[PDB]
Design a protein around this nucleic acid. Structure first.
Ligand SMILES: [Mg+2]
Ligand SMILES: [Mg+2]
Ligand SMILES: [Mg+2]
Ligand SMILES: [Mg+2]
Ligand SMILES: [Mg+2]
Ligand SMILES: [Mg+2]
Ligand SMILES: [Mg+2]
Ligand SMILES: [Mg+2]
Ligand SMILES: [Mg+2]
Ligand SMILES: [Mg+2]
Ligand SMILES: [Mg+2]
Ligand SMILES: [Mg+2]
Ligand SMILES: [Mg+2]
Ligand SMILES: [Mg+2]
Ligand SMILES: [Mg+2]
Ligand SMILES: [Mg+2]
Ligand SMILES: [Mg+2]
Ligand SMILES: [Mg+2]
Ligand SMILES: [Mg+2]
Ligand SMILES: [Mg+2]
Ligand SMILES: [Mg+2]
Ligand SMILES: [Mg+2]
Ligand SMILES: [Mg+2]
Ligand SMILES: [Mg+2]
Ligand SMILES: [Mg+2]
Ligand SMILES: [Mg+2]
Ligand SMILES: [Mg+2]
Ligand SMILES: [Mg+2]
Ligand SMILES: [Mg+2]
Ligand SMILES: [Mg+2]
Ligand SMILES: [Mg+2]
Ligand SMILES: [Mg+2]
Ligand SMILES: [Mg+2]
Ligand SMILES: [Mg+2]
Ligand SMILES: [Mg+2]
Ligand SMILES: [Mg+2]
Ligand SMILES: [Mg+2]
Ligand SMILES: [Mg+2]
Ligand SMILES: [Mg+2]
Ligand SMILES: [Mg+2]
Ligand SMILES: [Mg+2]
Ligand SMILES: [Mg+2]
Ligand SMILES: [Mg+2]
Ligand SMILES: [Mg+2]
Ligand SMILES: [Mg+2]
Ligand SMILES: [Mg+2]
Ligand SMILES: [Mg+2]
Ligand SMILES: [Mg+2]
Ligand SMILES: [Mg+2]
Ligand SMILES: [Mg+2]
Ligand SMILES: [Mg+2]
Ligand SMILES: [Mg+2]
Ligand SMILES: [Mg+2]
Ligand SMILES: [Mg+2]
Ligand SMILES: [Mg+2]
Ligand SMILES: [Mg+2]
Ligand SMILES: [Mg+2]
Ligand SMILES: [Mg+2]
Ligand SMILES: [Mg+2]
Ligand SMILES: [Mg+2]
Ligand SMILES: [Mg+2]
Lengths: 66, 138, 111, 80, 45, 181
RNA sequence: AAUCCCCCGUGCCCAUAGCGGCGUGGAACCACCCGUUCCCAUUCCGAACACGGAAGUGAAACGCGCCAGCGCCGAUGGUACUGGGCGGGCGACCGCCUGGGAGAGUAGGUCGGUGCGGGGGA
RNA sequence: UCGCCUCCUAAAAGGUAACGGAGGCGCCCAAAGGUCCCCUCAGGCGGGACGGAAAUCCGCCGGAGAGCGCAAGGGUAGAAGGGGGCCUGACUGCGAGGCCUGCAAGCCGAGCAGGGGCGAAAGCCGGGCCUAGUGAACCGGUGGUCCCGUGUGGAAGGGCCA
RNA sequence: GCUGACUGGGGCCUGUAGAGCACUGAUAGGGCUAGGGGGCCCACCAGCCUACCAAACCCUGUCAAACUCCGAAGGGUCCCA
RNA sequence: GCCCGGAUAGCUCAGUCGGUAGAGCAGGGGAUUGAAAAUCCCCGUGUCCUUGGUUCGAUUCCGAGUCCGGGCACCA
RNA sequence: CGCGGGGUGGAGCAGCCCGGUAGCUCGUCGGGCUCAUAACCCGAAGGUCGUCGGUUCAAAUCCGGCCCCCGCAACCA
RNA sequence: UUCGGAUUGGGGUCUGCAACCCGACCCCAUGAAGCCGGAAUCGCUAGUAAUCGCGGAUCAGCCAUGCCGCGGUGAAUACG
C-alpha cells in the first residue's frame, strides 16, 4: 500500500441490536450499527416474526362459523 | 429472377471460357442430371426458362435442384459508341462436364422428358445422365 | 491466454540485446539461487558459466550475487573476454540482478 | 460522378522488390530489398531504413534465410 | 502556420512547423546554433 | 492487522468442513478466497468529475483502500460519453483487507438492507466466482447518512480458487453468506 | 574426467513440436510458498514488479510420459496447368509430340527433434 | 478529364495502354515526436445496482479477425498497438555507398566531427509503420552575414546564408 | 579486348495458369438454433407451434480481376563454364 | 499589405472636454380594450472591441492586439 | 444518354454548406366568444427526412447506387 | 407540511329476503392531484355578499355535496 493517500484502518469496537463485534479493524473506530440480521434478529436465525400467509388462512376460517 | 444480393463490385471483366472443368460434374442431389457439353454464359433468364419448363412438366410435383447460379454481371452499352464501360444489365459461367438442374423424386420417363425440354431452353448442347457408383458417396 | 507477459518481456528485452551482437551475459534468478551465463549466439554456445548453485554460497541473495558476478569476471576475463552486453532477461535491473551486474566488473563491463 | 467516367486514375509504379539476390556481391551501403511492410526482416550485417528498406552494412555476399513463422531474413556474409 | 524561430543573439537560427492554435504561447524549445553550442531558442516573426 | 475474525473462522472450521464434504487429496485443492473487487460504475458523474472524488473518498472509507478510476474504453453516442471520460471507481482488495471488509459486509452491511430475504443464489458465474450489486452505500458502517449527497451503489465481485459453483457456494455459505436458498 | 539418465538455463529446426484427455515428479533444481522491515513497487491492490525468507505443497505453473477426437504434416498413382514443337474448329474452344508438373483427395505420419553450458546421478 | 497515393487490369522480376474497374490526397500531431520502463487486442459465453445490443466490473475461451490520425495495400502484439518518467535528435557540419531514373528530380543510407537527450548498460535518437499531404527557374519581401563597394572613406545597390 | 546473344549447372526472387474456400464476399439443398414475421391464449412476466424471416453453427454443393490455405510450367538476377 | 474606421445588455444599436451609464420594437410584471395593438406605468453586469499600463477612477488615455469595413494597394 | 437543382408532419416552405439541434405559415384536434357559423382568442397533436447501402462515436446533414420531380442541352448532319 | 384527504389494502357495524355488479357508517393502514387556476366567466347593493351550523320533505337504508327552509357572526362598494 503506497505511503500517503489512505484511510487509517485501525482496530475498533462496534455495536448493534446485539452486543459488540470485537472484530472491527476498520476506519473510523467506534461505530453504531442500527440493527443486523446476522446476530439473528430479522431473517437469519429465523425469527419469522409478524409472519404472513394469513390471507388464504383467514377467509377459510371466519367463514363457516359466522 | 435469379441474381445475387450484395455484390462487392458492380461490373467485372469478361474473362475466358477456357479449360472446361472444375467442380460440379458429379450429380450430388438427385436422380437424373442435365450435364453441360459446351461452355457458355447461361443467363438468369435461360435458367428460369428451364426451371419453369420442368415444374410445368410435372404437376407442380417432383423436386428440382438447379445447382448453377448467375453471379457474374453482364454489361451492355446503349447504341452509343465507346466512353466508359457499363451498363446494367447476370450470368452463370458454365463449362463442360457440369450438372445444372438435376431433378428427383419423379419417374424415369418423367425426369428424362422434363430434362429434355429443359435442355431445349439452353444455348449449348446437353447430356442427360442417371447416377452412379461413380458419383461416389462423400 | 496465450504467450504470457513474462515471455513477451523476456523476448522483447532479449532481441534488442541480440541485435547489437556482443556476447550475451544472461541472467537466470530463481527464488533460491541466481545463475549467470555468457553466450555467443550464431555459434549457439555457452562460454563462461557462474552459479551461486555451483559456488555453494548463501545468505543475502544480493550479496551472493555481487559475488557470482565477481566470480564471472575473474573467470571470464581469463579467456580474453572484456566487452559484453547485459541480458537481464525478464528481470528489472534492480537488487539481486543489478548487484550481480555491478559485481561483474573488475573485467567485462560498462555495466 | 458515375457514368462519363468517375474512374481513370492510378499512381506511379513504385519499382519495389529485391534489388540483390542470394550469392551476389555487395558493398557497404548497397540496398538489397525495397519493400512495403517488413516483408523481409534485416539479418546479419543488414540495416533497415525508415521506409523498411534493407541495405548491406558491410561488403560481402548476401544469404537468404527462411525462419518459418519468424519470417524471412537477409544477411550479409563478410570476407568483405 | 509556418514558423520562424530565433534564440537571442546574431539572429540566424533554424526553421519549423506549428500549424496550430496550440501551443499558442511563446512556443520555445532547446536547439543547437550555428554560432556556439546548444542554447534556448524562442519563436518569433 | 493479521488477526481478523473471519480469516480466523475460515481456517478453524470453514476449511475442515469443506474437506469433509468434498474431500481433498491436497491442502491447496481446498478453496481459498482471493480478490474481492469492488466496482462502482457511475455514468451519474459524466461531465462532472467533481462529484466523482467524493464517491472515491467514500469507497476508501469503507474499503480502507483508495480506488483507482476506470475511464471509457470506446466512445458511444446514445448516452453522451466521450472516449476520454471517467466512468467509475474500481478498487481491488485482497489479503487481510478483503477479510476485514467481508466481515463488515456480512455482519453489518447486508443486514441493514431494506427487505433482504437473502443473497441471490444464482449469481455464481459458473466457474465458481460470485457477484452481487447494491443500490445504496449508506448500508455501510463508515457512512453517516449525512455525508450522502446522492445514492450510488456498486458491483461486488468475489473471486475464488474453487473450480465449481457448488464448491464455491459451500465456501461462502460456510463463511456466513446469507443465501435465499 | 567420456558415456548414458534426470533437472535447470539457453540456442536451433518452426505446429510431425498444438489443443484436449489421462498419468506422473518435490531428494535436487524449479515453482507456487512465508512475510513486507529494508531496496523497489501498484493511475487502487506486494496480483504484477521488488526484496528478507524457508515452515508447507507439487494443488496451480513447469517438466516427463501415454492416447489420434480435433488441429498440424502428407505420399505413390492419376489428372489440371504448362516451356518447346505440331495439328484441328466458323466460333467458343479442342487435340498430339517432347520436356517440366500441381492443387484437392486417398494411403499414411505425428502427442516433437536437437546444440551448447551447468546441477545431479553413470 | 489534366498533378499526387492505393488496388486491380499487369500475362508469379521491373516495367507496361484505353474517355478500362474502383477509391483517396492538396492535410494533420508540441504530442500523434525521442528514449527507458511496463502493459496486450477484437470478439463469444457466464456473472454483476441503477447499465439497455452496447459506460464500468469479474471469470473463462479468444493468435490476431482489433489498434496503428485519414484511402487502400503491405505490414505489425517477439510491436509498429496502449500507459507512464525523463526529455526536443521535428540538431548543426558532412556523407561511403546504392535504389531509381532520358534530364531535372525523387528515395534509402551506414559512418565521422561538434554539442546534446533518454538509458546501469548494449545502445537508440538527423520527426511520425510505410507508400499521397505537393510546385523548376525567374522577379521581389524580410532576418543575418563575413563578400563586392565604379578616384578614395563611407553610403546606394548587390552577393552569400536563412 | 572475351566480357556478347544463346546454352549447361548451381543458388536466390515471384504469387500468374491450374486449384482451392482457411480470409473478403457471393452461393444451391437439408439440419439445429438466437431475434420475430405474429396464429393469437395474453392483454402480468407468460407463451408455444412454424411448409415465412434468420444470425452464427454442422452436413452436402458451388463462384470471384480488385478473395488466397495452396501453387506448376516459365520468367528474372548473380556465380562458374 | 496597410492606412484606418467599425465593434452594446436580447438584437439593431445611440453615448470619449475621462471622475461605475444608457432608449424604441423586444422579454416579463401592471393599468387600458372586442381582441390584435397602440399608448401609459415598473425590473433586467452590457464587467460594454481584448490584454498589460497612467491616474482616485474607468465603453470611452499609452505598447501589442481579435475582429469589421470600404477604398486603395500588391501578387514571382 | 448528357450536365444543374430537388424529394422533410395533411398542403406549401425553411433546416442540409458547417454532423449532435427538425423549424415557419396553413390545415387538423380540444376549449372559449356567438342564438348560431365564419372571423377572432387560449391550448394541443402530428415526422424519421424518397429509398438501399457506406462513413463516423453520432447522418435530414458527408459519400455511393437505384427511383421519381423540375430545369437546361441534344450542334456541324 | 399536524396543510389536503382522492386512491387502495385489511378489519368490522347497520338496514335489508339479499349490498358481486351498485349501499351508507366506524376503525387501522394508505396517503394522490392541489402552492389560487388560459382565453373566458357568475352571483350579490345590507342584515345582502362571504362564512358557520341546524331542521324537514322523499325515505328500509342510501350514494344529499342536492333541494325547500332556520337561525349565528357579518363586510365592501355605487363617481356616474
Ligand atoms: Mg465442370
Ligand atoms: Mg470439388
Ligand atoms: Mg449472352
Ligand atoms: Mg461517332
Ligand atoms: Mg440445346
Ligand atoms: Mg501500381
Ligand atoms: Mg450460476
Ligand atoms: Mg474460480
Ligand atoms: Mg503451418
Ligand atoms: Mg521441495
Ligand atoms: Mg515433502
Ligand atoms: Mg500438478
Ligand atoms: Mg495434401
Ligand atoms: Mg505426383
Ligand atoms: Mg504448349
Ligand atoms: Mg493453334
Ligand atoms: Mg499433392
Ligand atoms: Mg500432437
Ligand atoms: Mg533443449
Ligand atoms: Mg552434466
Ligand atoms: Mg491483393
Ligand atoms: Mg508484374
Ligand atoms: Mg509477367
Ligand atoms: Mg477525385
Ligand atoms: Mg513518451
Ligand atoms: Mg481479451
Ligand atoms: Mg471482452
Ligand atoms: Mg455480460
Ligand atoms: Mg490489421
Ligand atoms: Mg488504413
Ligand atoms: Mg491492410
Ligand atoms: Mg551519392
Ligand atoms: Mg539519376
Ligand atoms: Mg558526438
Ligand atoms: Mg548518462
Ligand atoms: Mg546517421
Ligand atoms: Mg521569364
Ligand atoms: Mg534576389
Ligand atoms: Mg567609392
Ligand atoms: Mg570595404
Ligand atoms: Mg564615384
Ligand atoms: Mg546592404
Ligand atoms: Mg570465352
Ligand atoms: Mg536460374
Ligand atoms: Mg482462376
Ligand atoms: Mg470462402
Ligand atoms: Mg486470381
Ligand atoms: Mg502442399
Ligand atoms: Mg565465359
Ligand atoms: Mg413537405
Ligand atoms: Mg375548433
Ligand atoms: Mg366559431
Ligand atoms: Mg440518396
Ligand atoms: Mg448511420
Ligand atoms: Mg456552327
Ligand atoms: Mg354494486
Ligand atoms: Mg405553502
Ligand atoms: Mg377556479
Ligand atoms: Mg337590487
Ligand atoms: Mg333519509
Ligand atoms: Mg343537510
Amino acid at each position: 500500500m503506497k505511503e500517503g493517500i489512505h484511510p487509517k484502518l485501525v482496530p475498533a469496537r462496534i455495536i448493534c441490536g446485539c452486543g459488540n463485534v470485537i472484530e472491527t479493524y476498520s476506519t473510523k473506530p467506534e461505530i453504531y450499527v442500527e440493527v443486523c440480521s446476522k446476530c439473528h434478529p430479522f431473517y437469519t436465525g429465523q425469527q419469522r416474526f409478524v409472519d404472513t400467509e394469513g390471507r388464504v388462512e383467514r377467509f377459510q376460517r371466519r367463514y363457516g362459523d359466522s | 429472377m435469379l441474381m445475387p444480393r450484395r455484390m462487392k463490385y458492380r461490373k467485372q471483366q469478361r474473362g475466358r471460357l477456357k479449360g472446361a472443368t472444375k467442380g460440379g460434374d458429379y450429380v450430388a442431389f438427385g436422380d437424373y442430371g442435365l450435364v453441360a457439353l459446351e461452355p457458355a454464359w447461361i443467363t438468369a433468364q435461360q435458367i428460369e426458362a428451364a426451371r419453369v419448363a420442368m415444374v410445368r412438366h410435372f404437376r407442380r410435383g417432383g423436386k428440382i435442384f438447379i445447382r448453377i447460379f448467375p453471379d457474374k454481371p453482364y454489361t451492355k452499352k446503349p447504341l452509343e459508341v465507346r466512353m466508359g464501360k457499363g451498363k446494367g444489365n447476370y450470368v452463370a459461367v458454365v463449362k463442360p462436364g457440369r450438372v445444372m438442374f438435376e431433378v428427383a423424386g419423379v419417374t424415369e420417363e418423367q425426369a428424362m422428358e422434363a430434362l429434355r425440354i429443359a435442355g431445349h431452353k439452353l444455348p449449348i448442347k446437353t447430356k442427360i445422365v442417371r447416377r452412379d457408383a461413380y458419383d461416389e458417396a462423400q | 491466454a496465450r504467450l504470457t507477459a513474462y515471455e513477451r518481456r523476456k523476448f522483447r528485452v532479449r532481441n534488442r540485446i541480440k541485435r547489437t551482437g556482443r556476447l550475451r551475459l544472461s541472467v537466470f534468478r530463481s527464488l533460491k539461487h541466481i545463475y549467470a551465463q555468457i553466450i555467443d549466439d550464431e555459434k549457439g554456445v555457452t562460454l563462461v558459466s557462474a552459479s551461486s548453485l555451483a559456488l555453494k554460497l548463501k545468505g543475502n541473495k544480493t550479496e551472493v550475487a555481487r559475488q557470482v558476478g565477481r566470480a564471472l569476471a575473474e573467470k571470464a576475463l581469463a579467456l580474453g573476454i572484456k566487452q559484453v552486453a547485459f541480458d537481464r532477461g525478464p528481470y528489472k535491473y534492480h537488487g539481486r540482478v543489478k548487484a550481480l551486474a555491478e559485481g561483474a566488473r573488475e573485467g567485462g563491463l560498462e555495466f | 460522378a458515375l457514368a462519363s467516367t468517375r474512374n481513370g486514375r492510378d499512381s506511379q509504379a513504385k519499382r519495389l522488390g529485391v534489388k540483390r539476390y542470394e550469392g551476389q556481391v555487395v558493398r557497404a551501403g548497397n540496398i538489397l530489398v525495397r519493400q512495403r511492410g517488413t516483408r523481409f526482416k534485416p539479418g546479419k550485417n543488414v540495416g533497415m531504413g525508415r521506409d523498411f528498406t534493407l541495405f548491406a552494412l558491410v561488403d560481402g555476399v548476401v544469404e537468404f534465410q527462411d525462419r518459418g513463422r519468424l519470417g524471412r531474413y537477409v544477411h550479409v556474409r563478410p570476407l568483405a | 502556420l509556418l514558423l520562424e524561430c530565433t534564440e537571442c543573439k546574431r539572429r540566424n537560427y533554424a526553421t519549423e512547423k506549428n500549424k496550430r492554435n496550440t501551443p499558442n504561447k511563446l512556443e520555445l524549445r532547446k536547439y543547437c546554433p550555428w554560432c556556439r553550442k546548444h542554447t534556448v531558442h524562442r519563436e518569433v516573426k | 492487522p493479521l488477526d481478523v475474525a473471519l480469516k480466523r473462522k475460515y481456517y478453524e472450521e470453514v476449511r475442515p468442513e469443506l474437506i469433509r464434504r468434498f474431500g481433498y487429496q491436497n491442502v491447496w485443492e481446498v478453496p481459498r478466497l482471493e480478490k474481492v473487487v469492488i466496482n462502482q460504475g457511475l455514468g451519474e458523474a459524466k461531465e462532472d468529475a467533481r462529484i466523482l472524488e467524493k464517491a472515491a473518498q467514500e469507497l476508501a472509507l469503507i474499503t480502507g483502500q483508495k480506488p483507482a478510476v476506470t475511464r471509457a474504453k470506446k466512445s458511444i453516442s446514445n448516452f453522451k460519453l466521450r472516449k476520454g471520460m471517467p466512468i467509475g471507481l474500481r478498487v481491488t482488495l485482497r489479503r487481510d483487507r478483503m477479510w476485514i471488509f467481508l466481515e463488515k459486509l456480512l455482519n453489518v452491511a447486508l443486514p441493514r438492507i431494506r427487505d433482504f430475504r437473502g443473497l441471490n443464489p444464482n449469481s455464481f458465474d459458473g466457474r465458481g466466482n460470485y457477484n452481487l450489486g447494491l443500490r445504496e452505500q449508506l448500508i455501510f458502517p463508515e457512512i453517516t447518512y449525512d455525508m450522502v449527497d446522492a445514492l450510488r451503489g456498486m458491483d461486488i465481485a468475489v473471486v475464488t480458487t474453487a473450480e465449481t459453483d457448488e464448491e464455491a457456494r459451500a465456501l461462502l455459505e460456510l463463511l456466513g453468506f446469507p443465501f435465499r436458498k
